[PDB]
């Protein structure tokens with residue numbers, strides 16, 4: 001997989017963000033995670049976490065997996081990196097997302113994220129409290 005540039009246009013919620021990619025505004029949905037909806041328990045915390053991580057980044061990058069690059073709603077499907085740190089992984093590691101939506105052919109980082117989830121759960125963090 002390859003990291004490619006993007007710039008933040010606007011935070012949306014814990015697992016979606018609006019980024020400019022190849023010069024075009026897109027909504028991106030983070031691969032392999034599910035955050036609570038803003039209206040649900042830990043939803044606001046997840047949104048806040050993602051918003052900060054993107055806003056504080058000097059450099060945002062997107063990394064497509066091997067399969068589908070856009071979902072049925074037109075959202076880009078990617079692993080997102082803030083100054084080299086994968087946002088998807090960081091959410092799961094903090095107990096603010098569950099590993100989810102693991103489709104065959106877009107699951108390169110599954111094990112990495114499952115390891116994060118196990119550590120969050122052992123720590124009883126957030127969703128695992």
Ligand SMILES: Cc1cn([C@H]2C[C@H](OP(=O)(O)O)[C@@H](COP(=O)(O)O)O2)c(=O)[nH]c1=O
Nearest residue numbers: 029030031032033034071072077101103106
């Ligand atoms: C993360 C992800 C979501 N989706 C679709 C499945 C879900 O369909 P449904 O909308 O029919 O439930 C939806 C979940 O996204 P959200 O968690 O953003 O709602 O997005 C994909 O198709 N591929 C993906 O990799």
Ligand SMILES: [Ca+2]
Nearest residue numbers: 015034035037
């Ligand atoms: Ca969600």
